[PDB]
Amino acid sequence: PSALNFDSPSSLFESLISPIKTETFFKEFWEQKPLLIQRDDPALATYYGSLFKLTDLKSLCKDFDQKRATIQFHQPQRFKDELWRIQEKLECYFGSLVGSNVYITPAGSQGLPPHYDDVEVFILQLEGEKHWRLYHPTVPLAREYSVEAEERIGRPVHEFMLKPGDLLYFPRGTIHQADTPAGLAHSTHVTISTYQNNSWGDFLLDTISGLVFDTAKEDVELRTGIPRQLLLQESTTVATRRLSGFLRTLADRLEGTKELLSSDMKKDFIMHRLPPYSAKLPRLDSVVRLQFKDHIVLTVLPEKMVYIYHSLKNSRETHMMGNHGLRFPLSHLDALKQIWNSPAISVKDLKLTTDEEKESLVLSLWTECLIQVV
Amino acid sequence: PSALNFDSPSSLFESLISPIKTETFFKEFWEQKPLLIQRDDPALATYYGSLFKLTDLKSLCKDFDQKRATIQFHQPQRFKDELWRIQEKLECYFGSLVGSNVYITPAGSQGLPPHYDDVEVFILQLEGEKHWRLYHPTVPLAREYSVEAEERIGRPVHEFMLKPGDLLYFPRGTIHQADTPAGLAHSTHVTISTYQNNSWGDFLLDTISGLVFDTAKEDVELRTGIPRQLLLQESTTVATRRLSGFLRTLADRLEGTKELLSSDMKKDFIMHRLPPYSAKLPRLDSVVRLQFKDHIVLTVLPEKMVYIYHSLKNSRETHMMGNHGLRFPLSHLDALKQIWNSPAISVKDLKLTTDEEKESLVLSLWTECLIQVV
Amino acid sequence: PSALNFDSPSSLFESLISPIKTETFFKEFWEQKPLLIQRDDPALATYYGSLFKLTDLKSLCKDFDQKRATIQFHQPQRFKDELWRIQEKLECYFGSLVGSNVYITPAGSQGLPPHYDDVEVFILQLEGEKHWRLYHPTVPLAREYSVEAEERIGRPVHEFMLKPGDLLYFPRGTIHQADTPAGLAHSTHVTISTYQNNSWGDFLLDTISGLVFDTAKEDVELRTGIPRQLLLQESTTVATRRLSGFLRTLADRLEGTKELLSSDMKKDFIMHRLPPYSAKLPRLDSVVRLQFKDHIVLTVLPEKMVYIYHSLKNSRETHMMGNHGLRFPLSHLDALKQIWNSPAISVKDLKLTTDEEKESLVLSLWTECLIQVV
Ligand SMILES: O=C(O)CNC(=O)C(=O)O
Ligand SMILES: O=C(O)CNC(=O)C(=O)O
Ligand SMILES: O=C(O)CNC(=O)C(=O)O
Ligand SMILES: [Mn+2]
Ligand SMILES: [Mn+2]
Ligand SMILES: [Mn+2]
Ligand code: NI
Ligand code: NI
Ligand code: NI
Ligand code: NI
Ligand code: NI
Ligand code: NI
Ligand code: NI
Ligand code: NI
Ligand code: NI
Ligand code: NI
Ligand code: NI
Ligand code: NI
Ligand code: NI
Ligand code: NI
Ligand code: NI
Ligand code: NI
Ligand code: NI
Ligand code: NI
């Protein structure tokens, strides 16, 4: 029950927030308020204690910051197998990049000053205890990180002591501050984070181009040039009124829209996500199924070609630090769309001229591990 | 009258289309239909003949293509002074990049096959005659270049013979084809082009980010995360309906909007445009005026800083081939906005703490040639 | 008399400080106190006015700083011919690098705050007037630059107004401050500087190695190893007492020393100095003379070789920005020393085995312009 179940992205998330049900988490907590899961599970406490240890910092004897009396180890999933296993599963579950930072603070020391972050967090207490104080957001669902002065935050809303095996979730914009109680024991926790720049605002700006391109093919007013020197000649009343009309027309056009195109979001997720955790040949008469659907991008790029790219060979060692696929002719697009939008498809049923072309396509997909033979 | 008047961008354009009045050009021709200016000016004919010559191709003895029986010399303004002088003036006038291509076709040869272009063109006949046929657009105000089959274009709408000193204007999407009459004389013309990707559609996508950023600061619904796996899990009815609502809200928000921010259009124009054609010290008690306003970008970039960049030191030799400024603290933003939005301003009237800071600002602007002392 | 006489380094310096005699300058002023030369020479005023102009900054339309309300143009000798001519002559005269900076301050503005510099300066007033205040040094003959607070400098010792054609000399460590009088005219001056890190202390550290190398060849105590871990195991009484003895022995050894070797000073001067200002073949029976003696370094470097390097082909454009010669066998050293230490020498008189070797040596020197045929 408490033990992390790596069977599916769903079973991992369900086990991570145990005993809380996912229906409860999404209805009551997600992007709304903090969730504190205090447990009494010595097995889970031993498990959390193995995710990262103070000794792992000395097994790295750049990858960490020294903010006052706090060591921050960036992206431990680069070296810690279990965290790679957890974070990869969460990326499948959220459809968003999932990074992590380890925070180590000696006994009796204050951590970072009061602040809020731009990410949804899952804090796992690994070693020792840490005293937390949570305050009401000044900016609910903040899009940026910010420190907040103690005289602007008010009194804590939640205050508690985290111990190994405990989990704390809180949405972006939650003002917080933590300190290690005086004593012998230092504190070690991992902050697993997701949902950075994954808002409706980000999604609208990511899909707007495809919508304008489609509309302009049918509407000559969108194809019409702007007035001379508009880019240079404080703004004008004329431009805002025309743009209001265009946005209203696009809103009406969306009602009939069946497909939205991602300009960069889908592509950036696929290129940056973690690779899958690592420890039959198709024929004309076989049935195929596309596998790892949420790990693939199918785009048309310039004469144009169909491009397929996946995350199956992504570098684990570069994940979140910030510093693979195929190409086919446009004629293959109908057959590739048949594979994408089908639970299972016969190779002979593909929309290509020769039976050889059908076989070559599926053989290409199989060499990348993008298809499974049923 | 006919002679090109380089006094201002306005006087250059007025003289270029002589005897046609700019009021007539904008009301009747611009982005609507072709304008043929056939003249009887031997002085202008000699002038056009000096803009580019077949001999100039041999004075370049990559910079040109060999499309069938037509030589196309790219961007002659890189070496021809008079064309640099003309094109620079047109960039000020249009607020859009202005490139050119020279077309040389021997007597008796067909040019390029029927097609339409994605730019507004001004064709100047420099040497010999060329036989033109213009057809009705299949795609009015086309956003892309395309060849069109002779059996899809119909009969010509306009047919004429261009000779030196003649000008031909036509909007993007105009299907056309030209051939050099049989005889002794080859044809040389220059196609001055502008308004590539300068439509209302391009402008809407260029300003939309600033609008969403501003709205999301006040609207928590734009700050709210998308549903899990939306980027991956064919599109849904839910997303299109939410996006329709957001676009309608943004349209209402635009009515009250006084300023629009350019994400890239203004910046790309400034970085790529031609430099100005080339052949008093400010004090605390002096009056200053910002000069070359349409050659400057003032942006805030990340801690944030105010960045100023101009086109006054742009490379002439790289113009349109595709292969300078200052930095100030955020405190200077109010004073820089005072300079931008003022016909003339006293240095002592600037919103800065010390009189020295006021003097340093204007001295910085003067070293870049961005200010004039009144 | 007042006009700059470029006949020799001596005649240039004599004319630069006119009407002051060089005997007076060295006895009374050099490294002792300021010298103000206020003149009434309209010809010299016109001459100074041509050395650098506010317009020369716009003829550069990195090479300058913008310190508050003062523009500082670094190393104008890179582009200004007359300043190259002056500074090159001064490097011959001083045997020290001679750089310059132009200072431009608008009317009514304060210059840099009170400070002292680490160089000997010759300030030439080129355009307008500047109000100077000189104070008593806090650090006489300072080795570093430093600002000094107004409450630590006392009252001015000297106060004057510089006008075009005026010269001001002051030693390193002289606290000073200048401001442009209120009015219409900006101020332009050039600060010609020399004697940076050219002290007895610098010279002692530059020659000490050669002295220790020579002494250790004869003294086994200098060849003896230090005690184990001396470099690591706060200092000890034993080391200081031994070092006192060594320094006393070296002092006694210097009395008999006839030649001092430069570890880097001579080499750095030759590599960085300005090239000479630009607008017979030797035979066995000819008499030769080494020319540009103060532009050449003769060193033995590793099997060892004799290396000759000169400054005759130094880059003018890189002077003071901070970002040529021959090689011969060790057997040639006696003959090269004969050329160095002789006002004129017969080629046949050189200490080399064959007459051909004598001819080859002098032919090598002639190709670099290091020898003149008498
Ligand atoms: O432990 C700390 O000092 C601070 N940790 C965080 O801000 C966090 O996990 O977001
Ligand atoms: O001259 C030609 O053959 C074709 N010229 C053009 O297509 C043009 O100027 O757009
Ligand atoms: O002119 C000024 O403001 C200051 N000039 C100097 O410090 C100088 O020449 O050393
Ligand atoms: Mn128990
Ligand atoms: Mn006539
Ligand atoms: Mn006089
Ligand atoms: Ni860091
Ligand atoms: Ni935090
Ligand atoms: Ni506490
Ligand atoms: Ni990247
Ligand atoms: Ni591969
Ligand atoms: Ni194929
Ligand atoms: Ni080309
Ligand atoms: Ni064309
Ligand atoms: Ni014809
Ligand atoms: Ni570019
Ligand atoms: Ni510049
Ligand atoms: Ni300033
Ligand atoms: Ni500098
Ligand atoms: Ni100084
Ligand atoms: Ni004064
Ligand atoms: Ni150097
Ligand atoms: Ni040489
Ligand atoms: Ni020899």
UniProtKB/Swiss-Prot annotation, chains A, B, C:
Pfam families the record matches: JmjC_2 (PF08007), ROXA-like_wH (PF20514)
Cofactor(s) listed in the protein's UniProt record: Fe(2+)
Modification Phosphoserine occurs at: S244
Positions that bind Fe cation: H115, D117, H176
Keyword Transcription appears in the UniProt entry: yes
Compartments reported by the entry: Nucleus; Nucleus, Nucleolus
Enzyme Commission number(s) from the entry: 1.14.11.79
Protein name per its UniProtKB record: Ribosomal oxygenase 2
Protein's organism: Homo sapiens
Entry comment describing in which tissues the protein is expressed: Expressed in liver, skeletal muscle, heart, pancreas, and placenta. Not detected in brain, lung or kidney. Expressed in several lung cancer tissues, but is barely detected in the adjacent non-cancerous tissues. Also highly expressed in several esophageal squamous cell carcinoma (ESCC), and colon cancer tissues, and in various cancer cell lines.
Gene: RIOX2
Reported function: Oxygenase that can act as both a histone lysine demethylase and a ribosomal histidine hydroxylase. Is involved in the demethylation of trimethylated 'Lys-9' on histone H3 (H3K9me3), leading to an increase in ribosomal RNA expression. Also catalyzes the hydroxylation of 60S ribosomal protein L27a on 'His-39'. May play an important role in cell growth and survival. May be involved in ribosome biogenesis, most likely during the assembly process of pre-ribosomal particles.
UniProt cross-references to PANTHER family, sorted A to Z: MINA53 MYC INDUCED NUCLEAR ANTIGEN, RIBOSOMAL OXYGENASE 2
UniProtKB keywords: Dioxygenase, Iron, Metal-binding, Nucleus, Oxidoreductase, Phosphoprotein, Ribosome biogenesis, Transcription, Transcription regulation
Induction record: Up-regulated in response to MYC, in alveolar macrophages from coal miners and in silica particle-treated A549 lung cancer cells.
Matching InterPro entries: JmjC_dom, NO66-like, ROXA-like_wH
Chain ranges passing through the membrane: none
PROSITE patterns per record: JMJC
Main location: nucleus
GO biological process: ribosome biogenesis
Record has RNA-binding as a keyword: no
Source domain of life: Eukaryota
Catalytic function, reaction form: L-histidyl-[protein] + 2-oxoglutarate + O2 = (3S)-3-hydroxy-L-histidyl-[protein] + succinate + CO2; L-histidyl-[ribosomal protein uL15] + 2-oxoglutarate + O2 = (3S)-3-hydroxy-L-histidyl-[ribosomal protein uL15] + succinate + CO2
Cofactor detail note: Binds 1 Fe(2+) ion per subunit.
Domain JmjC: 75-207
One annotated Gene Ontology cellular component of this protein: cytosol
Family stated for the protein in its record: Belongs to the ROX family. MINA53 subfamily.
GO terms, molecular function: histone demethylase activity; histone H3K36 demethylase activity; histone H3K4 demethylase activity; identical protein binding; metal ion binding; peptidyl-histidine dioxygenase activity; transcription corepressor activity
